[PDB]
Amino acid sequence: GVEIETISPGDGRTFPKKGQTCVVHYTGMLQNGKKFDSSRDRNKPFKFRIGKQEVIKGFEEGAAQMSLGQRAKLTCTPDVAYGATGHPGVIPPNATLIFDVELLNLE
Template sequence: MLKLLVPRATPQRSFSTTRKLMSDLNIEILSPGNGSDYPKSGDVLTVHYTGTLTNGKKFDSSLDRGKPFQFRIGQGMVIQGWDQGFAKLSLGEKARLTVPPLMAYGNRGFPGLIPPMSTLVFDVELLAINDLKA
């Protein structure tokens, strides 16, 4: 079940919608996509992302490497928060995914980068679904 919350408009942002899933994954839409093309399990997604801890410390970014990241959605290739979060985004959409620890790296964290039980924040953009580009 998806709960859609529309926050008050802020001067810095012309569009923002927040979706909170029952799993405590939070999806804030920063820029809408095409609204018609959504990923399904098994699709290959091409994305850009920047990952930070809740204190703002960046731990990874495809933008810093200058190359988008690709993965097959729904196949366990990425953290659960990404599999569930990207499934709710349409082609071209930009969003902020706030991923709770148990949908990210949980008790183990990611040594040297992500402490155990960390909530992660990802600014993401869905660039392509299979060969369909935004």
Template structure:
């Protein structure tokens, strides 16, 4: 994956590529996950992942810091990236009292989940697919299914299947 330097005050480092087809444009409503940390010491100051509630906003409308408006527009749907943002494109000389110190450079791990109604769908791994299927089956049935596979006849031998005539 590469690092794209957008301006002297920020860069985007791709962790996981997106679809490479759908990119946000000004005015699009985006849905994202993010974790924000201070570049100086890695202290986390905010995260949408803590409560598993994605963040929704309109890109290019000034609803987020400049570093997001610039950096996120370079990401494609489904992409996971690291935004390195200097204070000039974040919260400036003042910071955010109690959360972000003055002149703090920030690092955001971001994931672009949706652009408008277009949601990124990736192929699940075998483990993820099994977990998804298991989530639909009541736990007592899952336990019974695994126990049924291990059942033996009362004398400890395996049951023999009856032959059909």
């Protein structure tokens, strides 16, 4: 399940399509816990493409329901990211994921 909560500004028309590479200043957060990832530290703003299952499902679907300039707030259920296995030592099993996501993309 993906629950979009958008900080408004942008254009509301420039949606990501297939074969496009988008630029995201993502910021992870665990529910009732601390951070676990941020691209604001490295300043390498994570140029990835659409439709190749490189990112997780809960982050891939949230990018399609955003536009250029928008600033969402994801809420990823455990079944779409890691909730059965759990990432080793970083993401515990059966955990709810929160993502502060900015989309200032290209293409």
